[PDB]
Amino acid sequence: QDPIKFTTGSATPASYNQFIDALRERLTGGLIYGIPVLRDPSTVEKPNQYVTVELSYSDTVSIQLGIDLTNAYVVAYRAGSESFFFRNAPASASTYLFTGTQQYSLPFDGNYDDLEKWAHQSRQRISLGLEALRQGIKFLRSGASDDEEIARTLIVIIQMVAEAARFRYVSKLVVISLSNRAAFQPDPSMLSLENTWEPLSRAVQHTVQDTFPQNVTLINVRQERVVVSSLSHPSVSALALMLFVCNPLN
Amino acid sequence: SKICSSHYEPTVRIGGRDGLCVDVSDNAYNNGNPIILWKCKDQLEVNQLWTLKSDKTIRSKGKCLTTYGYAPGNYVMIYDCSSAVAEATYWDIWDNGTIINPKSGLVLSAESSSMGGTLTVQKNDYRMRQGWRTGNDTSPFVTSIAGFFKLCMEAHGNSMWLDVCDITKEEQQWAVYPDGSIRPVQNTNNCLTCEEHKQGATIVMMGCSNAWASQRWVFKSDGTIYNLYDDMVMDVKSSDPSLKQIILWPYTGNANQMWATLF
Ligand SMILES: *[C@@H]1O[C@H](CO)[C@@H](O)[C@H](O)[C@H]1NC(C)=O
Ligand SMILES: *[C@H]1O[C@H](CO)[C@@H](O)[C@H](O)[C@H]1NC(C)=O
Structure with missing residues (x-):
């Protein structure tokens, strides 16, 4: 009934996973070859293109994120009576999200190049974990007008919520982190998955004779090139949610 | 955002038992030359490359992967796609890693545990020796x-x-x-x-x-x-x-x- 929420104050491997599954379930438009797929963009009306998610720090401190149901991308966040949309956001985001708050534009887009650029730090150097997430929510709920820090914290949240929903690999890494009570940085395989979501989605959906039409290259911990070409390649299990590309039939 | 195109006919290697590759014996392409499992070579050679044709044939250098017959034990060979019985050249590569011949209902198998062995079709038991993975990168x-x-x-x-x-x-x-x-x-x-x-x-x-x-x-x-x-x-x-x-x-x-x- 109510919008998907994550109570960080009592987070556990179990509550976090419950949070992610609910977000995946909410984002699932259908299934292709047994893999959940985002709703077909030319099927959703603008008033139903966004969903909200809440991240709370305490019973009185929390923020909400705005997410496009079409690509699982975070387009904005709300803090108190204010809301902030990525410079890259289309007219419809503020039109249907955060109505009722003073809305503002961020000087940077929601992509990693821009976020990394404004954070003066690439993903590989930004730590992830429960203590980072909670530090981030508290920072966004306040108003410290620091763009460098906002981009950095948003990079933390995007991967712990958005990528986590897209990849079973990311959510898994976040859980070992909670269990470990130890921060961690994305290894080259985590970035490989983030940077390859779209083509992987295209590969799967174009599968014929259990084979992708064009190979998809992934990079592992040792930075070795793992060239995938099969829908039944073990690495494909790292995918929890696909971007919609085409319905198979003909 | 409409329908996926499936006219793509990719060419890749097919790995299987113990990481060996589906190889065309001594690069010999004479009708009947047996298909075996050989060490996946350092170079991407033609005798270990297959094209997933749209008509459901798996070709190498123009010839068709083919079963001698429709009975358990029959081996598979390279063979002219026109000269051969059509049913003996069709194959379905499932999402489970099973390569099955529709007409016989039998599946590609590597019964020998020694490199060089000839491939055959057998009753399907989902055994390690009947599991395959398409892709040039067969590691x-x-x-x-x-x-x-x-x-x-x-x-x-x-x-x-x-x-x-x-x-x-x-x-x-x-x-x-x-x-x-x-x-x-x-x-x-x-x-x-x-x-x-x-x-x-x-x-x-x-x-x-x-x-x-x-x-x-x-x-x-x-x-x-x-x-x-x-x-x-x-x-x-x-x-x-x-x-x-x-x-x-x-x-x-x-x-x-x-x-x-x-x-
Ligand atoms: C596999 O290798 C062959 C020869 O190098 C190439 O033509 C074919 O396209 C490759 N398969 C791919 C990239 O799907
Ligand atoms: C895989 O092969 C076909 C289609 O993919 C299916 O009917 C069969 O059940 C599968 N193998 C299993 C799950 O035993």
């Missing part, structure tokens, strides 16, 4: 296998159980072969296999030379490690890590049945 997929809560699969001699994930431990590196077998990086002769084809059997180490249906596994979209033949999945005994025991059990979907390839 085994090395990676960690994470179970629930910060716990990873670790090899202990001829036993396997959970331990706190630690990327520095070689005993936690696994090699998933194109045939569906999960092998310990330190000894690719070992293969995780169920002790018995029954609910509750523990997963142990056994010589891969057997190539049983109990040594083949698929990493399913639902986060489980699944066995085709038994129709069950790897499961942490009563969700208790201390039991140092990973067993076979029917799908429940619980945390103790969720895994993730952490490569």
Whole structure:
């Protein structure tokens, strides 16, 4: 009934996973070859293109994120009576999200190049974990007008919520982190998955004779090139949610 | 955003038993020359490259992968696609890693455990020796296998159980072969296999030379490690890590049945 929420104050491997599954379930438009797929963009009306998610720090401190149901991308966040949309956001985001708050534009887009650029730090150097997430929510709920820090914290949240929903690999890494009570940085395989979501989605959906039409290259911990070409390649299990590309039939 | 195009006919290698490749004997393309399993060569050679034709033929240098006949034991060969019986040239490559010939209902198999062996068609038993993976890159997929809560699969001699994930431990590196077998990086002769084809059997180490249906596994979209033949999945005994025991059990979907390839 109510919008998907994550109570960080009592987070556990179990509550976090419950949070992610609910977000995946909410984002699932259908299934292709047994893999959940985002709703077909030319099927959703603008008033139903966004969903909200809440991240709370305490019973009185929390923020909400705005997410496009079409690509699982975070387009904005709300803090108190204010809301902030990525410079890259289309007219419809503020039109249907955060109505009722003073809305503002961020000087940077929601992509990693821009976020990394404004954070003066690439993903590989930004730590992830429960203590980072909670530090981030508290920072966004306040108003410290620091763009460098906002981009950095948003990079933390995007991967712990958005990528986590897209990849079973990311959510898994976040859980070992909670269990470990130890921060961690994305290894080259985590970035490989983030940077390859779209083509992987295209590969799967174009599968014929259990084979992708064009190979998809992934990079592992040792930075070795793992060239995938099969829908039944073990690495494909790292995918929890696909971007919609085409319905198979003909 | 409409319909996917399926006119693409890719050319790739087909790996299988023990990471060997589907090879056309001595690059000989005379009608009847047997198809065997050979060491996947350093170079991408034509006699080990196949084109997934739209009409359902698997061609190499213009000829068709073909079964001599429709009976268990019949071997497969290279053969002119027009001169041959059409039914003997069609193949379905399923999502399970099974290459099946529609007309006979039999599946591509590598019965010999020695390189050079001829391929044949057999009653399908979802055995390691009947599992294949298309793709020029035919190497085994090395990676960690994470179970629930910060716990990873670790090899202990001829036993396997959970331990706190630690990327520095070689005993936690696994090699998933194109045939569906999960092998310990330190000894690719070992293969995780169920002790018995029954609910509750523990997963142990056994010589891969057997190539049983109990040594083949698929990493399913639902986060489980699944066995085709038994129709069950790897499961942490009563969700208790201390039991140092990973067993076979029917799908429940619980945390103790969720895994993730952490490569
Ligand atoms: C496999 O290798 C062959 C020859 O190098 C190439 O023509 C083919 O396209 C490759 N398969 C791919 C990239 O799907
Ligand atoms: C895989 O092959 C076909 C289609 O993919 C399916 O009918 C069969 O059940 C599958 N193998 C299994 C799950 O035993």
